[PDB]
PDB file of N, CA, C and O in Angstrom:
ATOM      1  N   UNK A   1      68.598 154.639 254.081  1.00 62.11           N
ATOM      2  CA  UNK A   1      68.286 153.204 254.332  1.00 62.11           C
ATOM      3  C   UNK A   1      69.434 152.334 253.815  1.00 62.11           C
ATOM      4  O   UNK A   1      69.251 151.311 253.155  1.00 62.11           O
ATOM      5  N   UNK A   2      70.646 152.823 254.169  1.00 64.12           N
ATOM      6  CA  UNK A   2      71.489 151.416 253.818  1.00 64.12           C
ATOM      7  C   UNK A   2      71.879 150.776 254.485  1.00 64.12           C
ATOM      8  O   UNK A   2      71.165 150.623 255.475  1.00 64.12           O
ATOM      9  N   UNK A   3      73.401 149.849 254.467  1.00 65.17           N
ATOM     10  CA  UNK A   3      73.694 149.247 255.267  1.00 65.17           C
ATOM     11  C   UNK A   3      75.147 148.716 255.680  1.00 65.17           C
ATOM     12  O   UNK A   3      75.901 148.187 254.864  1.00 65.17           O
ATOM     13  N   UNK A   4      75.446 148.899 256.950  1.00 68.65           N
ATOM     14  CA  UNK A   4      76.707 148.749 257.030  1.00 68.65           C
ATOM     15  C   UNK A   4      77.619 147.235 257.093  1.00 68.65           C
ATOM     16  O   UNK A   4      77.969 146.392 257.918  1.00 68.65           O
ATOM     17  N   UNK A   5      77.744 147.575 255.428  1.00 73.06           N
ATOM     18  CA  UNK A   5      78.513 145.993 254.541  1.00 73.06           C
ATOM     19  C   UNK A   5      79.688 145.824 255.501  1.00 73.06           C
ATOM     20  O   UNK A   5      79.733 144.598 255.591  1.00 73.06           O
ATOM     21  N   UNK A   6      80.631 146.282 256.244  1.00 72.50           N
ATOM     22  CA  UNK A   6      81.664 145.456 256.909  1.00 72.50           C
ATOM     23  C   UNK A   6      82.088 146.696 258.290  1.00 72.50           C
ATOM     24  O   UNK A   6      82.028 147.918 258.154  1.00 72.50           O
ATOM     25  N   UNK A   7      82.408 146.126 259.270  1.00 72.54           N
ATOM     26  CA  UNK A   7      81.877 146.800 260.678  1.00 72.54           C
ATOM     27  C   UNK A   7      83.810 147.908 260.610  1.00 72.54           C
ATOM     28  O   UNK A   7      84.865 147.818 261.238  1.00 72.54           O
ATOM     29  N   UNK A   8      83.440 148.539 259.816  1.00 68.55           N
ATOM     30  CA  UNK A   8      84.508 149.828 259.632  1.00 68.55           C
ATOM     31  C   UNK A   8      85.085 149.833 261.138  1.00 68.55           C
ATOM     32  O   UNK A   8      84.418 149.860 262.172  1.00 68.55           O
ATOM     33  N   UNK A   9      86.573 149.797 261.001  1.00 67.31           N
ATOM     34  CA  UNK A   9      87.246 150.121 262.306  1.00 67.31           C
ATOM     35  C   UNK A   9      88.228 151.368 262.269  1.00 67.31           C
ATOM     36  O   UNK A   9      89.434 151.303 262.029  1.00 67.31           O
ATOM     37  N   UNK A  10      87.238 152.924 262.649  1.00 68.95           N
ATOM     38  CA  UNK A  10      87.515 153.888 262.422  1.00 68.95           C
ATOM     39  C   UNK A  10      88.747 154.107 263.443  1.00 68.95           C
ATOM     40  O   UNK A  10      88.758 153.306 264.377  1.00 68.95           O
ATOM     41  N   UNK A  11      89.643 154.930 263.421  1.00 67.62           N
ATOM     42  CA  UNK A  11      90.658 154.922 264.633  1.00 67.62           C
ATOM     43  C   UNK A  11      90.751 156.079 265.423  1.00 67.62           C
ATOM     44  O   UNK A  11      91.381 156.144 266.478  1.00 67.62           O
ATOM     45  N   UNK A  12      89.922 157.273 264.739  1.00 65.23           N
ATOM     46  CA  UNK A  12      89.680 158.359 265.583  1.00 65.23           C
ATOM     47  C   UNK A  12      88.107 158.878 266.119  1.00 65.23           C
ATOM     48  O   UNK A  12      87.009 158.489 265.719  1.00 65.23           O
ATOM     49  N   UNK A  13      88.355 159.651 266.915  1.00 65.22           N
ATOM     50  CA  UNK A  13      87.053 159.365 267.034  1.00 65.22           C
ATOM     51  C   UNK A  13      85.589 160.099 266.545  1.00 65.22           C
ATOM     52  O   UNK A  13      84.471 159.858 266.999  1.00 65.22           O
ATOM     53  N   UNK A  14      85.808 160.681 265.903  1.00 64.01           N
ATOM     54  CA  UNK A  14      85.175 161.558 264.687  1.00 64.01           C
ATOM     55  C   UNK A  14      84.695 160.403 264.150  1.00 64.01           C
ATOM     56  O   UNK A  14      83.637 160.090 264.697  1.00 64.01           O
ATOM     57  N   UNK A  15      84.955 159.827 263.508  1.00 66.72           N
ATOM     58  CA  UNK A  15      83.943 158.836 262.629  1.00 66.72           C
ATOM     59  C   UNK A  15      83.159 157.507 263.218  1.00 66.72           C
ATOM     60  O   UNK A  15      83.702 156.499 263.671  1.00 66.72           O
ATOM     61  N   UNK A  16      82.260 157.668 263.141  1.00 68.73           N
ATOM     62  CA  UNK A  16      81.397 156.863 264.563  1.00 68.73           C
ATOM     63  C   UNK A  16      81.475 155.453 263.883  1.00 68.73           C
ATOM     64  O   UNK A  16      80.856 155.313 262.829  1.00 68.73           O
ATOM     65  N   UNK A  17      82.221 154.336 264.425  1.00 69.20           N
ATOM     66  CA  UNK A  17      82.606 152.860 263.742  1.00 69.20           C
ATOM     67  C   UNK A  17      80.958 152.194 264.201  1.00 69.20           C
ATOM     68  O   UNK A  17      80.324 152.380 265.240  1.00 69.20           O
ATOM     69  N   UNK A  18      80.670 151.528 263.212  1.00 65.20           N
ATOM     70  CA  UNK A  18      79.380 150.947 263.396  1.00 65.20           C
ATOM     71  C   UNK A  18      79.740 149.631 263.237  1.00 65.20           C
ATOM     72  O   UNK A  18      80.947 149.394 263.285  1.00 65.20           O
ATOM     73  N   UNK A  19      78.804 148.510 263.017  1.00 66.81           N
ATOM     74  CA  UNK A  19      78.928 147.114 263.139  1.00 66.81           C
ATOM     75  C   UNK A  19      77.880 146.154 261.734  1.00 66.81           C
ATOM     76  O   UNK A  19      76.653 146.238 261.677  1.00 66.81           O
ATOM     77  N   UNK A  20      78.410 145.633 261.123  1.00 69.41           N
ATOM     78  CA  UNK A  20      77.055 144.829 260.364  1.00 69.41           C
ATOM     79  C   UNK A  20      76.052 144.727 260.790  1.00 69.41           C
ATOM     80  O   UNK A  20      75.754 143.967 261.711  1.00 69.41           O
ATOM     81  N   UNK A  21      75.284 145.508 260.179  1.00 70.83           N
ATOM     82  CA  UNK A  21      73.762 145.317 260.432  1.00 70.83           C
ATOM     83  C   UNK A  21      73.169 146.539 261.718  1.00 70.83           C
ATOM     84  O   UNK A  21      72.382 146.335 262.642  1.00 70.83           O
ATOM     85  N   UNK A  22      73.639 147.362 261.469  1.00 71.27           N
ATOM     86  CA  UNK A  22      73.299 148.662 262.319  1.00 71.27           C
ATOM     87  C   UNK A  22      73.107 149.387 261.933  1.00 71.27           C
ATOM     88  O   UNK A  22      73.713 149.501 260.868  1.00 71.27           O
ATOM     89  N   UNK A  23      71.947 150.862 262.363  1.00 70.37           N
ATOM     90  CA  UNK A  23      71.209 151.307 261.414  1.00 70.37           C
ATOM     91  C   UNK A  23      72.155 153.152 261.269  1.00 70.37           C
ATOM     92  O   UNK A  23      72.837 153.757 262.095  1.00 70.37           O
ATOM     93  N   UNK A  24      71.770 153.480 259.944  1.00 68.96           N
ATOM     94  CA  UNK A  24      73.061 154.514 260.131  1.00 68.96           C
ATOM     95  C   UNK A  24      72.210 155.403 258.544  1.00 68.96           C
ATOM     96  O   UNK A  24      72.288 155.098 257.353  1.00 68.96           O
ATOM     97  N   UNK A  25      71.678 156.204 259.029  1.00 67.37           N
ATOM     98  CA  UNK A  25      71.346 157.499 257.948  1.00 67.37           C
ATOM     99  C   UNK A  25      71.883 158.014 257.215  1.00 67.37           C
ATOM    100  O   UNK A  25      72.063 159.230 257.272  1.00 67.37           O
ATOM    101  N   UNK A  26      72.387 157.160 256.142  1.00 66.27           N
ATOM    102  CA  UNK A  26      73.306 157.794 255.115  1.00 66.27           C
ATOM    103  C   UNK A  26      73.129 159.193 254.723  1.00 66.27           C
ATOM    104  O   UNK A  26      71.908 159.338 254.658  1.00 66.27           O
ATOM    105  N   UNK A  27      73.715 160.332 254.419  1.00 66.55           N
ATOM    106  CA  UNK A  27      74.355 161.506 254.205  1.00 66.55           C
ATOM    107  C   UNK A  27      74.031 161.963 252.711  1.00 66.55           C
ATOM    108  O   UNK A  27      73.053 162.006 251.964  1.00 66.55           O
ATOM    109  N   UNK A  28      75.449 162.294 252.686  1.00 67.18           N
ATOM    110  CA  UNK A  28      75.578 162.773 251.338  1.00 67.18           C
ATOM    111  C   UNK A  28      76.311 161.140 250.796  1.00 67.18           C
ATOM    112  O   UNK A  28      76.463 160.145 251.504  1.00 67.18           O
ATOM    113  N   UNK A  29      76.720 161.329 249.109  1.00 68.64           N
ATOM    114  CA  UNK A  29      77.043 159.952 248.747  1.00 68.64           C
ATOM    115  C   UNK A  29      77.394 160.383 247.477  1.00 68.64           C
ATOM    116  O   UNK A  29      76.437 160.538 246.718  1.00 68.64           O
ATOM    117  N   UNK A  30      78.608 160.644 246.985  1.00 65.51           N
ATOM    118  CA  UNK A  30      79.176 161.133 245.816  1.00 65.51           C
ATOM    119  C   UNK A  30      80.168 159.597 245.206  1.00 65.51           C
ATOM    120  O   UNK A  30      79.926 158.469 245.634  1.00 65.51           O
ATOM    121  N   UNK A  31      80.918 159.802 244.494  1.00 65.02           N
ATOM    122  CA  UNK A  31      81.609 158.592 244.179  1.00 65.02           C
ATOM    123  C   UNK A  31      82.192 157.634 245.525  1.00 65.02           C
ATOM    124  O   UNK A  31      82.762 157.969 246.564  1.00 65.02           O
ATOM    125  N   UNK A  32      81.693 156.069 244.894  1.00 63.77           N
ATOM    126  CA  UNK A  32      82.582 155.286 246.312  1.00 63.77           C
ATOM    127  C   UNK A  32      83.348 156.198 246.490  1.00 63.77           C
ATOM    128  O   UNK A  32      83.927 156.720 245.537  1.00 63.77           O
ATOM    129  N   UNK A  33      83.563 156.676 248.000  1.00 61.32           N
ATOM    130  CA  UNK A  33      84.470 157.230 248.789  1.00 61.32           C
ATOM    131  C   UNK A  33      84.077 157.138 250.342  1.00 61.32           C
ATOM    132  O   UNK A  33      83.695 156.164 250.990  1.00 61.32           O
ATOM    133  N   UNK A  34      84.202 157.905 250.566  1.00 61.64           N
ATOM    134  CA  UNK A  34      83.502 158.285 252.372  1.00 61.64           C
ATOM    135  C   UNK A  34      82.487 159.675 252.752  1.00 61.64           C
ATOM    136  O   UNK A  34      82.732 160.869 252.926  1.00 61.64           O
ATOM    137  N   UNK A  35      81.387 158.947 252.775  1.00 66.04           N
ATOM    138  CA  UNK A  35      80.384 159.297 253.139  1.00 66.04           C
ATOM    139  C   UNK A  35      80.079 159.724 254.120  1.00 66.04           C
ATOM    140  O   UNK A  35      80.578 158.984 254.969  1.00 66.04           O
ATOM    141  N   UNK A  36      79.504 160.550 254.621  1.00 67.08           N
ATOM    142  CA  UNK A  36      79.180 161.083 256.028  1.00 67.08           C
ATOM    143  C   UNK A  36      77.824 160.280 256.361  1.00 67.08           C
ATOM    144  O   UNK A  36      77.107 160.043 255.389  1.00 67.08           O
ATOM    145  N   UNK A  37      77.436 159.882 257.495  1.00 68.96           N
ATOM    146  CA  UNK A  37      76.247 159.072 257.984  1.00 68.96           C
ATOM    147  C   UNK A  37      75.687 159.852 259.498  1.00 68.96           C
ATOM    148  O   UNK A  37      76.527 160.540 260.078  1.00 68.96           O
ATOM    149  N   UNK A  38      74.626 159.767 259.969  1.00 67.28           N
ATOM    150  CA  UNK A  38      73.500 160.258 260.826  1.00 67.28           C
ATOM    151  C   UNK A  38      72.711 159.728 261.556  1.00 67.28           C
ATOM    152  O   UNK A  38      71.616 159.470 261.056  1.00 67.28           O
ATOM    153  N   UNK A  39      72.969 159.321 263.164  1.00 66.16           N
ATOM    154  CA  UNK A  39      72.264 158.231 263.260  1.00 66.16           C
ATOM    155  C   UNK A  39      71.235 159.209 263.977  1.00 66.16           C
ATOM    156  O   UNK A  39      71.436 160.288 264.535  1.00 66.16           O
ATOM    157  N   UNK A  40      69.807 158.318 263.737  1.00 65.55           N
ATOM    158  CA  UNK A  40      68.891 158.845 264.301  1.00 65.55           C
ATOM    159  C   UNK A  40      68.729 158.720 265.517  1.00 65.55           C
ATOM    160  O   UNK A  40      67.949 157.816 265.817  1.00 65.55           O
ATOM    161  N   UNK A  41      69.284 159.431 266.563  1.00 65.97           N
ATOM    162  CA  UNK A  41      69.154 159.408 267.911  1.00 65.97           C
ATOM    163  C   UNK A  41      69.472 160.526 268.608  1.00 65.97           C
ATOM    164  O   UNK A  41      68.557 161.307 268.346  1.00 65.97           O
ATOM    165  N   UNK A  42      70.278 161.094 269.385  1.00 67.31           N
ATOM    166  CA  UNK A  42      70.937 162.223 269.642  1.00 67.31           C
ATOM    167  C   UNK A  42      71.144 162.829 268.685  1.00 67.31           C
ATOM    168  O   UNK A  42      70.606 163.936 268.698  1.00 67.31           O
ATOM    169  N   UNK A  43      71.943 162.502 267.454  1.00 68.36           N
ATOM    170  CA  UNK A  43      72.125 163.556 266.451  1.00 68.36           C
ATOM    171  C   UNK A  43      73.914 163.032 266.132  1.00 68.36           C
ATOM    172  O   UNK A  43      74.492 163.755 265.321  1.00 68.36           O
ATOM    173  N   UNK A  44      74.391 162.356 266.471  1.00 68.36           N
ATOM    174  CA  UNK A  44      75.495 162.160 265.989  1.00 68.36           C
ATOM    175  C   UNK A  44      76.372 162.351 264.751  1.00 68.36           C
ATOM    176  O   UNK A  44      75.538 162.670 263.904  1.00 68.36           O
ATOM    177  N   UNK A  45      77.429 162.345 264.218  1.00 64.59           N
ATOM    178  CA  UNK A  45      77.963 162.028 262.705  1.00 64.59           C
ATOM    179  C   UNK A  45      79.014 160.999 262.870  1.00 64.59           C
ATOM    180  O   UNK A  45      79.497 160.684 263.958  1.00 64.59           O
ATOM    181  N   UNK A  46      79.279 160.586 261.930  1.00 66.10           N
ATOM    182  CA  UNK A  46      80.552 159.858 261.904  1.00 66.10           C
ATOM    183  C   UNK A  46      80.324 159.618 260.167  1.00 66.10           C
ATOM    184  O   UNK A  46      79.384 159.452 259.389  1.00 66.10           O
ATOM    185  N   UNK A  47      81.879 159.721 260.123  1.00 65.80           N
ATOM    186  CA  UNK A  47      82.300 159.463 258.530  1.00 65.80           C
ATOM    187  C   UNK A  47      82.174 158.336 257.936  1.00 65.80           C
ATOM    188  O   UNK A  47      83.220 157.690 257.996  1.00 65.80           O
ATOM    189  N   UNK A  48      81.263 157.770 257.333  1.00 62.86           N
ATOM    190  CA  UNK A  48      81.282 156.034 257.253  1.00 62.86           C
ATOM    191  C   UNK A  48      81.730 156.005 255.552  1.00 62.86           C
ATOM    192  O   UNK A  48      81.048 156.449 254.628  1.00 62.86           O
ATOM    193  N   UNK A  49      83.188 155.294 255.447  1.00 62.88           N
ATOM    194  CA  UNK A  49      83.474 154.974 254.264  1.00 62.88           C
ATOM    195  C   UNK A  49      82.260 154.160 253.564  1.00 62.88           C
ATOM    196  O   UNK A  49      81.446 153.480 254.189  1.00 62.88           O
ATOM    197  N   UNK A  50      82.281 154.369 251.985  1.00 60.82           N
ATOM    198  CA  UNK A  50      80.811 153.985 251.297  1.00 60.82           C
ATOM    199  C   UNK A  50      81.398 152.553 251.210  1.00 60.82           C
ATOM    200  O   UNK A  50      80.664 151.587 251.420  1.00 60.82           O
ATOM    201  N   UNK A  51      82.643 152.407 250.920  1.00 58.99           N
ATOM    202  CA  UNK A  51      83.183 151.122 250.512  1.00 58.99           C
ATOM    203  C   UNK A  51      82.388 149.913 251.558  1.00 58.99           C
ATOM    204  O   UNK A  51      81.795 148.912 251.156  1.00 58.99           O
ATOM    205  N   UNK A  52      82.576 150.338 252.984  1.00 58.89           N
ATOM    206  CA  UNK A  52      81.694 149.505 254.001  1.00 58.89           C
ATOM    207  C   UNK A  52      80.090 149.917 253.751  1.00 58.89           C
ATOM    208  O   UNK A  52      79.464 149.205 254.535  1.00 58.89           O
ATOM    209  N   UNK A  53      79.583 150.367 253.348  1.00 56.68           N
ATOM    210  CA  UNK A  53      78.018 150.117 253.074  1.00 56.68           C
ATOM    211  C   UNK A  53      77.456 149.850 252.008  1.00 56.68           C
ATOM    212  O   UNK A  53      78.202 149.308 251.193  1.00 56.68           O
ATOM    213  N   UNK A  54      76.470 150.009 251.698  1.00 56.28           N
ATOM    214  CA  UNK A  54      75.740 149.415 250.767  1.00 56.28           C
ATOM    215  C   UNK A  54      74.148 149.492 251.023  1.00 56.28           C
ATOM    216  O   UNK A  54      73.620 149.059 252.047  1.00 56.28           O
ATOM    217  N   UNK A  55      73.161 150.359 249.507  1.00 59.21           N
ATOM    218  CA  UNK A  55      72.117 150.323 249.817  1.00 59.21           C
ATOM    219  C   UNK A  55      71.257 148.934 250.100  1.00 59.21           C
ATOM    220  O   UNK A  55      71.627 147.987 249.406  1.00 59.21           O
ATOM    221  N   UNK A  56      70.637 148.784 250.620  1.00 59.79           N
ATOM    222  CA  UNK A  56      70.014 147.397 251.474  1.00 59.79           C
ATOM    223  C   UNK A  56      70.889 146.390 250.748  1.00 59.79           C
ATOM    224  O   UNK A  56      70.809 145.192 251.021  1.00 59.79           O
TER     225      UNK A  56
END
């Protein structure tokens, strides 16, 4: 349940770029770094730096 604090502009395409305020299943979550995220739909991944999210 967190949230994506600034709309990450990933440049490859492995890490699925999301937008403020879009919903994204945070992962695993070890020190600020980059986090892996899960969106609930198909099944996707993308790498979402933690620095851009934030729990609610």
């Amino acid at each position: 349940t967190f949230v994506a604090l600034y709309d990450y502009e990933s440049r490859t395409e492995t890490d699925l770029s999301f937008k403020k305020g879009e919903r994204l299943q945070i992962v695993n979550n070890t020190e600020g770094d980059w986090w892996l995220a899960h969106s609930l739909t198909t099944g996707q991944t993308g790498y979402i730096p933690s620095n851009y999210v934030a729990p609610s």
